[PDB]
Structures are given as C-alpha cells and as structure tokens.
Amino acid sequence: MSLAEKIKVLIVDDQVTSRLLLGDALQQLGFKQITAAGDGEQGMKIMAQNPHHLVISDFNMPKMDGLGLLQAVRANPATKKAAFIILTAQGDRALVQKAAALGANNVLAKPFTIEKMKAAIEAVFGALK
Structure with a gap:
C-alpha cells in the first residue's frame, strides 16, 4: 500500500537519558524505527505524519503523553x-x-x-488475540 512495513517506533522523551534509555532498551530489541520529535506532541505529528506502531514517551513534560497519544x-x-x-x-x-x-x-x-x-x-509486538 503506502508502507510495506508501516511499522515505525515512535520514542520521544524530554530527557535524553530517558529517551536514550528507552531507545537503548528498544535498540537492543531491534524494534523497527526510532522516531523522536520535540515531545509527545511533536513526536505525535511527526509520528502520525508517517508510519508508526509504537508510541513511547517519558513523564518529563510532554505535551502528548501516553494518554495524550491515545486521545490523538x-x-x-x-x-x-x-x-x-x-x-x-x-x-x-x-x-x-x-x-x-x-x-x-x-x-x-x-x-x-x-x-x-x-x-x-x-x-506490544505479539499482542495475540
């Protein structure tokens, strides 16, 4: 269709150590794609604007936290x-x-x-039935 993979991972955190950790942890997992932008909000539009299948953020001061993303x-x-x-x-x-x-x-x-x-x-990957 538009993305054979259409599987992109969005990870944005106010703190680098936080976003780095998540990105690091997921990195060793070989997630799919690490996409971070400004914050939940910035990463939300940047993520939505493109393919994604994961939305991870920190609790620093994101404009669109987990719940925020859900609402989006x-x-x-x-x-x-x-x-x-x-x-x-x-x-x-x-x-x-x-x-x-x-x-x-x-x-x-x-x-x-x-x-x-x-x-x-x-x-998050398996999510079977």
Missing part, C-alpha cells in the same frame, strides 16, 4: 494501531486497563529490567 489516536485511526508506552512511578495495570479501555490501543510500561521491558515489547 481517537482522532486518527492511523495511529489507533500504534501501541504507546508510558513509564511512571506507578505501574498499575489498573491505569493500563483504564486507558487501554478508554480507547488506547496499547499502554505498556518501560521498566529498567529487560525481563519486564522485553515482556512489554514482546506483548
């Missing part, structure tokens, strides 16, 4: 298939299901552990 997806079905990640000192499946049920396509946390991170990604 609700306006754009193009990113409605993009799984966003939101790392916070909360990590509650309740919030995940809350947003994930609010309309979000997929909300996963970005743990410092490869086990959790690999699991999250493994889910």
Whole structure:
C-alpha cells in the first residue's frame, strides 16, 4: 500500500537519558524505527505524519503523553494501531486497563529490567488475540 512495513517506533522523551534509555532498551530489541520529535506532541505529528506502531514517551513534560497519544489516536485511526508506552512511578495495570479501555490501543510500561521491558515489547509486538 503506502508502507510495506508501516511499522515505525515512535520514542520521544524530554530527557535524553530517558529517551536514550528507552531507545537503548528498544535498540537492543531491534524494534523497527526510532522516531523522536520535540515531545509527545511533536513526536505525535511527526509520528502520525508517517508510519508508526509504537508510541513511547517519558513523564518529563510532554505535551502528548501516553494518554495524550491515545486521545490523538481517537482522532486518527492511523495511529489507533500504534501501541504507546508510558513509564511512571506507578505501574498499575489498573491505569493500563483504564486507558487501554478508554480507547488506547496499547499502554505498556518501560521498566529498567529487560525481563519486564522485553515482556512489554514482546506483548506490544505479539499482542495475540
């Protein structure tokens, strides 16, 4: 169609260390494509403007955090298939299901552990039934 792969990873964080970590963790995972722009908002338009299948951001001061992205997806079905990640000192499946049920396509946390991170990604990728 427009993108044989149409599988791009969007990772934008206010802090480099944060965006670097995520990009690093996902890097070793060989995600697909690391796309970062300004912030959730900047990365949202930059991401939407193109193909994407992952939306990970930090909690620094993004104009469009995980939830923010979800809200955007609700306006754009193009990113409605993009799984966003939101790392916070909360990590509650309740919030995940809350947003994930609010309309979000997929909300996963970005743990410092490869086990959790690999699991999250493994889910964001697999997401079978």
